[PDB]
Amino acid sequence: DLLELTEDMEKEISNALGHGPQDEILSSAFKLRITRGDIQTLKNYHWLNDEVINFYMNLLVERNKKQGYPALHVFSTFFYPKLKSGGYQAVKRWTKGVNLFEQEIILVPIHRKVHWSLVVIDLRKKCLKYLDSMGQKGHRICEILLQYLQDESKTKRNSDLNLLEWTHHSMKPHEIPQQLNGSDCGMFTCKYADYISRDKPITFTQHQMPLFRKKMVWEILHQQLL
Q1: Which CATH superfamily is domain 1-226 in?
Q2: Is 127 a catalytic residue?
C-alpha cells in the first residue's frame, strides 16, 4: 500500500544506501545478515539479491501473524532450484519442524537465470498460481511443485494428496501488473507476495516500484512492514 515517507526515514534510508563499508551488517534476523552491500541491491535499477528477498519473505510471515492474516509459509529462494535438480530427497529436510498442510498460504520464490517470479500455493482452495511480471506461464513449475506436495504429504503424513481436487493457473498479462524495465523482477515478486498473502487484489503498478524500494529498505532496517 502507498504512503508518504518522512524526512527522518528518507534520512536513514539515504544512510543505508549511501557510501560506507560493504560488510557492515545493518539488520539481522531469521538467520540472515543484511549487509550494506545487500541492501544496496534495493537502489533503483539494481537487481535484488537472495538475502533481501528471503529477508522480506520472512517479514511477511510475521506481519501476517501479528495482523491476523492467513497462516503463511515462505520457502527459501534456494529451495526450488534444489528441488528441480535433486528431486524431493534433496529438499526433504527443508520443512523440518513444520507441517506445510497446517498453513494456509505457501509462497515459493522462483529464481531462473536472472529472472525472479512467484508461485502461490493456496491450501484453502487447493490451487497453485504462477505470478510473473514478464507475462510468462509456469505450467511445468506448478506441476513440479504439485508433485513436491504429494511427496511431502506421503512422507510426512503418510497420506496422498487428492490430486483430483487441485487446480493450477498462470495469471495472464492483464490479470497482474507487468514490469516495464529489466531490473524490477525481484521487487514485483516481493510485492506480489505481499498483496497475495493478505488476499488483497494486486492493484499496484510499475510506477510505484521506486517508492516500494525505498520503503523496503526502511522495513528491512527496522524489521517491520508499513
Answers
A1: Adenoviral Proteinase; Chain A (3.40.395.10)
A2: no
